[PDB]
Amino acid sequence: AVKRSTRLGCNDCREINYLTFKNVKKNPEKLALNKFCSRCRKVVVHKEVK
Amino acid sequence: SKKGVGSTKNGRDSHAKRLGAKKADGQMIRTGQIIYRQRGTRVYPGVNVGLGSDDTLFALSDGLVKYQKFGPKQGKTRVSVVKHKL
Amino acid sequence: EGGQTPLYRRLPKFGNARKGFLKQEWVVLNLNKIAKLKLDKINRASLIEKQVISAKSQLPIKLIGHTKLEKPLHFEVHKVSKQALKAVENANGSVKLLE
Amino acid sequence: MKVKSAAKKRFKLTKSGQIKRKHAYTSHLAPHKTTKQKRHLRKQGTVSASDFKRIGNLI
RNA sequence: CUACCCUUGGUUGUGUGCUGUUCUAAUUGGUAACUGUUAUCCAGUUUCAAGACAGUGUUAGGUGGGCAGUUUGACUGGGGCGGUCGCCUCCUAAAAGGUAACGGAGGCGUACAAAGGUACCUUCAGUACGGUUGGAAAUCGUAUGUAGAGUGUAAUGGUGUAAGGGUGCUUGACUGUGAGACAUACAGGUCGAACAGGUGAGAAAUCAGGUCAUAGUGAUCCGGUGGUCCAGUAUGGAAUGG
RNA sequence: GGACUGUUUAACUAAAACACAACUCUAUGCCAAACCGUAAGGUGAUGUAUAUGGGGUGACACCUGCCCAGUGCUGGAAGGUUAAAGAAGGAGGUUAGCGCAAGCGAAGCUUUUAACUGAAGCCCCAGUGAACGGCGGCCGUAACUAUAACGGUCCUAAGGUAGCGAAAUUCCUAGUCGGGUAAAUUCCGUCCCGCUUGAAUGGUGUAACCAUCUCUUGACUGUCUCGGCUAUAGACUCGGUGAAAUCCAGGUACGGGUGAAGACACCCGUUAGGCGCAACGGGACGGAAAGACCCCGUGAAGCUUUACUGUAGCUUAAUAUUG
RNA sequence: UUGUGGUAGACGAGCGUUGUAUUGGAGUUGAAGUCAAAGCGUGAGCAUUGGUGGAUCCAAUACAAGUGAGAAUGCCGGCA
RNA sequence: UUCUCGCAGUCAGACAGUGGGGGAUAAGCUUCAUUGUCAAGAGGGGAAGAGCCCAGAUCAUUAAAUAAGGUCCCCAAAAUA
RNA sequence: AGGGGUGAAAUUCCAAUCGAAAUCCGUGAUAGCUGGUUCUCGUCGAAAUAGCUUUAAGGCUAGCGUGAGAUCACAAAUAAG
RNA sequence: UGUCAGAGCACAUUAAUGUGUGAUGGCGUGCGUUUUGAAGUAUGAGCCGGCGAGUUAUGAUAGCAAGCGUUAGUUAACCAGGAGAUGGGGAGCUGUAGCGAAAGCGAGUUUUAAAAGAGCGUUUGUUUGUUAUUAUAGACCCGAAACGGGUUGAGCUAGUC
RNA sequence: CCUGAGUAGCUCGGAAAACGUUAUUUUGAGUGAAUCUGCCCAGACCAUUGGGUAAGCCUAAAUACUAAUUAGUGACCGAUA
C-alpha cells in the first residue's frame, strides 16, 4: 500500500530499534527521540535511518 | 429468464465476533479472566473490575461477578466483583 | 490435504551453518548408570572388557551428573562436569582429566 | 517410503515426541503489528491439538 | 604577469575498430581440358573465374504459430453475458452466542509526533433577547436549553464536567517477559494481571506496553541491508554460511 | 446466379462449390529465385525474362474511386536506444614484511564489476495500394411549403468514387405502387431512410450453355375430386428344411384415485368359458446404439492466434578457418 | 436389571472348504463321486441308507491359502 | 455429553410443525433457525400412501388389556336418552 | 509410407470406417467417473453441518459413531428454587 | 400368483403333531444398484454350469501375547548344514540427558541483565510372533478416446511415368 | 639427464558426480603452462601443513546370467488348469 515506514537506529550503539510512521507530507523535519537501548541498558537518544 | 444485471451491493455478513458476559453469577473467578466483551459501551465498571482498552472487561481481584442497576431510570448497568474473605 | 498450502510450507525454516559437517561425537558417562556397575581405573581398557564401547572406539568422553555415590570413582577422561567433579571429589576418589 | 526432509527442515525434534516449531508470520514485512504481538512471534510455539495425527504420519 | 575554468575551429599528435584499396598462396567454384576412363559419378594434374571473400563451426543477437508442449478460474434456480471473490458496521437473526441467500444498506485498503500520554483548567448544541457594518445565517452579553454539539472518518454503541476544547512537559507511540484467560478445524486472531530494568508526566499518590473501540490489510519461497557472545571441510584466515 | 467442354467429399447432399483460359500484382539474371531433405544429391531444369515462382479476381464490354492514420512492404541516412564480445580500471581477501598494539601493506593468486569500442534491430523520415484495412456526425441555409445545391462546426488519416439497389444482401417490411392473378406474405418492374450496398474476398450488363434455382402458361393426364378391375411374387393352405433380434418370473382387463409426481399387477368399483386363426397395430414409458442435442470433468483430441515458453528456419555480427 | 429395529460403519464369536504335518480309522463284504428320499442342527453345516460307480478316503488337532459367487450391458461352453 | 488411542462413515438429504428471506405469505418452490420422523426402523389408523397420529418389534404361542383409530353391510366391535 | 504423401480442394483419400491408417511394444498408461467385488452369527450404532480448498458428485479438520484404557465425584443431565 | 387356514382326494414314514396334492377363505405391487427417496414406465441381469476382484516384498504406527532385562537384548551380511532349526559372528539399534542453530552446558538447558518469568526435561524398556491401518511399487477388479517411438503397407482410392 | 604438452588449467556453453552445473571428473569452441627446491589434491580460495606424483598399456579372483545337457526336488498345475 502506501509505504510510509521509517526505521529507527541508535546514535552510539547503532542498533536498529523501532519502525515508526513519519509525516513528510506535512513536515520534512527530522526527529530525534529517546527510547530503550539494550547494549547499554538505558534510555538513549535515537534517530531515523533511511 | 436468466440474465445478468446491475449490482445490488453486498450484504455479506462480516465474521461475527462472540460477545457477551462470558462469566455469570455464582461462579468463582480469579484475577485476570475476562467477563464481558463488547465494542460499544453498554455496561460500566464499578470496583474490582478492569477495563481493557477496547471497551473490554476483566477481573482485577478474586471473587464473584455482581451487577448493579442505576442511572436516570435504572437502565444503566455497572459491574463489580464481590469478595469472600476468610 | 485436498488443495491447501501445506503446514510445513506455511511455517518458517530453521537455519544452521553446521551443514557440511555433523554433530560432535562423544561417548557419555553418567553417575546414575555407572552406579550399578562396579569398576575402578575406568579407561579405554575398562569399557571394552565391559562391552560399553567397541574395539573400534574413537569417541571422547563426557562426564555428567550430580548424584551421590559411595564408591571410589577413578576416571581418566577428556572433559568433566563441575557438579560431577564436586560429587566425585567429595567421595575421596580420584580425578584425572586426561584430554 | 522415505522421510520428508523438506518438512523436517522446519521442525525441531524434542524429547518424548511433542514436536515444536516457530511462530509463523514472517516472510516479507511487518510494519503493521504492535510490538506485543511481535514478541509473541519471537516466542517459539508448538503444534495444535488436532495436527498431531497430521504431522506424525509424515514422520 | 601568474593561473584556472570555458566554447567552436585549425595543426599534427598516440591508439580504436572500420567501411577503401592492391597481389595471390589459404580457400571456393553445378568454368573448361586431359589420365585413371571409353564413365553427365569421382579423384588427380591443373586453366579460368575469383578470392582472403564466401562457406563451415562456436558464440551473441534480432526475427521466427512454420512447428512443439501447455493454459484459457470458480460461484451460479441450466449454461454463457452480467455481478462477486479480502476484511469492518447496521438490519435480517426468533431480547445468550451463532444463523443462509446472485438479501437491503454502508464502507475500507486509513490519519495522527499530536488529533497521544501526563497534570491542570473549561463545557451542551440550539432558542430568544439587545447589540456598527453584519442581511435566512458572522460574533458579543444574558437567560433558556437534557442532547437534536463534538466524537479524526463508513456505521454501531457509549462518551452531558467526558474518550470533548485549551494550557505546560514529553514521546510508555519502552525493553525482556508473562499467570491468567476469550474465541477457536488448522492457520491463527484478542485481552491482560503481574514481575525486572530503564524512563517520562505529575508535589505525590497514581498514569503512560498509542489513539473510545469495533476495518485500514497477505501465509510461505526467493534475494537483499544493518548489527551480531554463532560456524569456518587439515590448520590459520578468508569467502560463504547461521 | 454461374460464363461455358470440365472436377469432386467411394457410401446423405454435385452445385450459386471447385477448377478454368484471360487479366492483375510481386519476386527472380544462373551454382537464378523457389522446393524436397539434415546432407550429399535431386526438381525448377538439360529452364534462361515472350522464362519461372508466388499472390489476387475470374468469357467478354466499359471502370476499379479517397486515405500510408496504425500494421505489412521498400529505401534512406543525419539523430536517440540497442546484445555478445575486446578491456583504462576499481575495491576486497591470503599475508613475506613493516608492525607494542591499532593496523599498514610488497609480490603472487583469487574475488567482482566497469571508462571506452561495439553489428543487426527499435524509435526516425520518405515512398508503398488489383497490401492488410477503412472510407464519419451535428447545425444552419432558398417569399407557399417540404427538401437540401451549399456553407460552418467536432473528430479522423480519410470521411464511400462510380455504379447498382427490399436483390442470394433490407429487422422495420406481408415497404409503397403497377401489372400478373376470379382471389397475390410468392413473381417481376419500379421509387431508394442502403442500421451495413459498394468497386478486384470486384461492379453493372453479357449471346449460347447449366441433369442450375425460381414464376407463369400450352398440351397432358388416377397429383387431386375419386375410386374400381384383371394377372403375377409372396402373405393363406399342404409339403422339405428352416433363423433372427429381446428376454428377473409371469396365471399379462377396464375406469377412478393414490403412488419416484402419467399403472397389467397398488387400493377402490366394473367387466371377461378354455384354447386358437387372419390379421392392423394403443401400449407394454416397444426392440435395436451406458444419448450423439445439453451440463460437468481442473477430460482428451484437433484448429487458430500479436496467450506463455521455446524450436525448425531467415537475417546481422565477434571468433578459428584466414593471408 | 438391561436387554435383542438398524444403513453404511465398528467391535466380537464361529463354520465349511485345498493341501502339508502327525496319533488313528475305514475300504469290492464297494472309498471318495453322483443323484433320491417322510432327517439333524441357533447359523454357516452335519448327517443315515439305497441305487449307479469302481479307488483311495475320513474323523481330532497344528500350519499355509489362487480359501466361500445373484448381480459386474462378466467371461467360457451349452441349452432355451 | 470429559481425557488418550485405533477404526471409521460422513459435507447431493428429504418430509411434518413452528418463524422468517426471496418469491406472489402461490408453489410436493427455494434458503436459514427450532422441535420430531424417515433416511438408518418394520407395524395399527388415515381407501391404499416415506416422512402425519398411535407408535419403537428377541423368537414361538389359537392369551388378555389398552393407545390412535373405529363400531349400518362388506370389515373387527354400540347401544341408550 | 503417415508431427507422410496425394490432391480440378469438400477435411478428398489412403486396403470397406482416418482432423491424421493398421499393428508391436512402452502399458497391467492414465480417468477427482460409472459398473461390480463371493461364509454365518452376536453387540453398539451415524450423518448429510461449519471452516478451507483452481473448490463445487475430489480432498482436509472439527463436529456427530464405535472399540480399548480410563477420570469415576468438584464430571454429566434430568426436577425444582 | 406364494403364505396362513382349509375341505376334499390318494397313498403309508429317518415313528414322525405321516406323506403327497390342494375347491375355497384371509393376506399380499420380484432381485440387487444408485440414491432424500426407486414396487416402479430408472439401471442391469434368458438361463444351466465352469471361472471371476484383497495378495506379495520392504517399512512405519498401533493393538494382543510371549521372551529377555537390570549395560540388557538383537546380530545383518557372511561361514558351517537336510538348500532345515541352529551355531559362530555386535558391524551397527533401540536406552540410560537432554537443551539450544551452535560453540557449549548439563538434570540443567534456551531468551535475557536475570540461576526473574516462561518452554523443554527433571530416566522410562528391548527383541520377537500375530493382527489392524498404512507408503513405495500396475497394489480391489473391470474399464477412457488418447500419447511416444518402431514396423507393415500407392494393387481400392489420389497422382505420375 | 629423464620420468607421457594443444596436456593441466583459463573464458563461454554442457553432462555426470546422491547436486538443478559447484569443488571433482569429461569435452564443444577459443586460449594455453611448469620441469624435482616440480606438480597437483585437501567441495570458492590464499598462506602454513600433510597426501600422493596425471597427461602409456594390460590384468584374472570374488560378484551377473541359465536357452543346453545330467540327476533330483517341489504343502507346483492336473485337460475351462
Next chain:
RNA sequence: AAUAAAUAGUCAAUUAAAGCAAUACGUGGUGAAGUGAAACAUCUCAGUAGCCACAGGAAAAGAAAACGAAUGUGAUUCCGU
C-alpha cells in the same frame, strides 16, 4: 597413365570374417512419450523403453597429481551397514 620419374590406378597371389544366434546378461552410442506433480511449463519415471555396434563365456573398471582429515587406509570389483 595424366606427368619424365614417382604415385593414383590396374593385374595376380596369401590370410581373417562377412553371417546367423542362449528370445537373457557386458559395454559404448543414440535416445522418448504417457504418467506424477491432483493443472502444468523446472523436475518425474530415465537414461527407462526403443534403436544402432562389437563380443564373451561372463563382461566391464582396475594398481594412488587415490580417498579423504586421521601422527589415517594402502589395486579394482561385490554384499550388509
